[PDB]
């Protein structure tokens, strides 16, 4: 479109577009210094936990490992120190002398955060999904399933629908379960109220009719409407 039309509209409206005005607020981002300090603290605490990990290694390998950890944390979004503390607790629970991979540490942090929010971990969620996939054909609807809590219902139904629609494999199912757990934990930590399904209609019933009365009704209908063929 030509600028002339917009300018003519601006001249015709003037104060109307001033009422429209322009959205405010800009973009603010954290500095690299905070991320560097977080990475240094994580590295120091891990070296304290696993002193033998960097034994017999030059500074170049240490710098490369630090760069890899920085990249992994930036990709996975490690900002709060509470996640770092949870990961350190999980690592102190772990019994492997060697230094864990950054992805494993991120998984530990996410798993501990999910467990803190009163939700099952990835393995329990996957087992529940498998049990649901085996047993849900025996119930009239998803709301008739014996659900423990609303979070279980939503997680299981969402994972089942996603898996059936996208033909997910086992590893893809586990990754989706981890993502769903992260999202549900984030929602729970933000307060929020989990809805109580939707339900679908009552069952009705109450049909106390026998064979003889039904035959009498059919005969009466035939007599009234003159259905000679029947």
């Amino acid at each position: 479109e030509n600028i002339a039309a917009q300018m003519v509209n601006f001249d015709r409206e003037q104060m109307r577009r001033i009422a429209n005005n322009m959205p405010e607020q800009y973009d603010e981002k954290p500095q690299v210094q905070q991320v560097a300090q977080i990475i240094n603290g994580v590295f120091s605490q891990l070296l304290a936990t696993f002193p033998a990990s960097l034994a017999n290694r030059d500074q170049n390998e240490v710098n490369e490992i630090r760069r890899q950890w920085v990249l992994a944390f930036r990709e996975n979004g490690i900002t709060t120190m509470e996640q770092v503390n949870a990961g350190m607790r999980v690592a102190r629970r772990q019994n492997r002398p060697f230094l864990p991979s950054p992805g494993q540490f991120v998984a530990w942090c996410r798993e501990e955060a999910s467990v803190t929010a009163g939700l099952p971990n990835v393995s329990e969620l996957v087992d529940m999904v498998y049990e649901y996939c085996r047993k849900r054909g025996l119930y009239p609807d998803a709301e008739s399933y014996p659900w423990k809590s609303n979070a279980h219902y939503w997680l299981v139904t969402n994972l089942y629908q996603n898996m059936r629609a996208n033909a997910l494999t086992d590893a893809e199912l586990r990754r989706k379960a981890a993502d769903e757990l992260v999202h549900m934990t984030a929602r729970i930590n933000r307060g929020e109220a989990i809805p109580e399904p939707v339900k679908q209609l009552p069952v009705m019933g109450g049909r106390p009719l026998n064979r003889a009365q039904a035959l009498a009704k059919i005969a009466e209908i035939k007599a009234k409407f003159g259905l000679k063929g029947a």
Binding site: E1, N2, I3, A4, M7, D11
Partner: peptide, 14 residues
């Protein structure tokens, strides 16, 4: 400025 732009009218935006 708008008078100058109307004199020019050589800008298009999509």
């Amino acid at each position: 400025t708008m008078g100058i732009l109307l004199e020019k009218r050589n800008i298009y935006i999509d």
